[PDB]
Amino acid sequence: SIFFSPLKYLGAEQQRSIDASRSLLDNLIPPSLPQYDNLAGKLARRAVLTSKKLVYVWTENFANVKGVPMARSVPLGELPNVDWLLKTAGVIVELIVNFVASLPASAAAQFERIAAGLSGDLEAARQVHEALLEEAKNDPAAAGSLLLRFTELQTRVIALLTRVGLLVDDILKSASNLGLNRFRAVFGTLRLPEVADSFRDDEAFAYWRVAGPNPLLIRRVDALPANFPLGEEQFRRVMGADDSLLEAAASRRLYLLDYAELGKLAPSGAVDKLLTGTGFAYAPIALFALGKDRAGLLPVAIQCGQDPATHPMFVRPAESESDLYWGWQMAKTVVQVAEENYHEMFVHLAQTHLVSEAFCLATQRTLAPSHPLHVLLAPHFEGTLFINEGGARILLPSAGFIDVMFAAPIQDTQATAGGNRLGFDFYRGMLPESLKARNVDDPAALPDYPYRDDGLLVWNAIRQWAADYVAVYYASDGDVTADVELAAWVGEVIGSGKVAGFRPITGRSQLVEVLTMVIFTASAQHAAVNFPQPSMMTYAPAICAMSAAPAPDSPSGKSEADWLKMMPPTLVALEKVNIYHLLGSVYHGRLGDYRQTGFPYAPVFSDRRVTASGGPLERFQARLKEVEATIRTRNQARRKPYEYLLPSRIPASTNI
């Protein structure tokens, strides 16, 4: 049929090239609020939004994450560009080569030729990338026509990653078939993280609470909870004869970790799995204290569960107390098991990735491409829909990485992470509110808290940027409430996005706070909780989301053998070292850059009022450079550098 004529030669590659070029053409349209657009503009933007709703589609029945608002599928223009594809393929291929090289030669035989070919093709692809960028710099006038060759390279790297996918599945099909030496052996040629040397140290263990992957749970305590019955004699055994619970509470020196919210991620008993044997996890309570000099936090006491009737109190022992040493190491391991569950499922997956999913969808469906807030927000969602589909499909099915690495049955893990996302309150989850609610917002009381102090620098810089940008387009609160696209966006965020606590936006100040939280969550918050993975979470003895043995049943009389029984099977350690290396090794885009991350790396902003010398954008960029210098200076004085919130290391979006 002559009506099939358009379909005869049309493929995904042509369509991607068309999308890529049309994006550049649409970036030049000057942005406007709907009520200030002309009638032709109102008509065109309404038509485009209606079309966008065909391809950006909400579902709450996405595979392996039921109940969580998700994109039904990833639109063509939301696949990662070739810069992200090469970086990620590079990391995965290198990890495969490293793994295969550690297998016995007879086992490696199944994979080594295929991995060598992938490694060769990847090097070829990088050479092409370098050469295309060489040609663009040599003949800038013809750079528009090079976009097509970049699109062709994208096709090639997509195909390579598809073949990597098959190889990884072939490896996992044979996983089973394929005393701390084993936890080093799984690294192969990779260097062990610094935590491997320090993990037994009590002060190191405490520092995780303020400078680790989960800086969000620690809170000041003024009176101990009824279900944590620590006595004064016990407290003085650790803190000295001239201290007391009363004195330490009054002087703001007591801090509590309580993992009650883990729910079914802390199974009530043993969970037996075919691939990993018998596994346990916990919802413990731990007390930390500052010395009177506030030099640093010290762990005082640990109860390995919520009910003191069934969980005895473990109190930090003196160095001489050899009979109490191993029970204490076991109690610390219990807390670290709770930590990987809480961090990965709640702080990372639920509260960054799965929140940003909803703001991405709302933004594409309700704010027109010519809306200044679409222009501002879209760079902060680059690669988000893609990486989250990856999470749901690759990491969360039965026998996948999360079923292996986390103790709970996979259905309970899926449901509990989902429930956490649905319960997460947007306003209460903002950094300054989080700090205030937990009473850890005062540097006099708790001086060494790098997440707070570096985090507030970035939060406030973003806030001032959102204020400057809003002020370009919205002259009054009436302009906010007159914006029909913003009102629709809020409607979808509440109704389809199910973001708890979200509310109508009725003025400029509130709009600024909302935008600050959206941008911070997409960029800095994700960076702070994602990029510690390779340096802090790759070594199983320092942290793992399952234990192979129950919590210690008594503080006294444990041996090294008792503690070793908690260590996970080698398969768990193998999946752990590889996934956490990958997820923290891809830095794609940078907060404040505001250029496309794919060729031709054009400016995000065309409006002269935004891009003016010394204007809103330049003020944000210069502020981030000051923040960078400030943090570098702080890290010279810190016991350990905390680098995760350096702006040079914060991607603009959540894409890994």
Ligand SMILES: CCCCCC/C=C\CCCCCCCCCC(=O)OC[C@H](COP(=O)(O)OCCN)OC(=O)CCC/C=C/CCCCCCCC
């Ligand atoms: C774990 C807790 C994380 C929680 C946070 C989750 C947040 C979202 C992160 C989502 C990340 C999604 C995971 C993929 C991220 C990589 C980016 C990506 O898009 O990968 C594309 C390819 C192809 O896709 P496809 O659909 O065609 O076929 C999937 C397999 N049937 O997938 C992979 O290579 C699987 C790599 C698995 C990791 C292998 C590690 C190295 C292998 C070394 C040897 C293996 C030794 C065992």
Ligand SMILES: [Fe+2]
């Ligand atoms: Fe991530």
Ligand SMILES: [Mg+2]
């Ligand atoms: Mg228990």
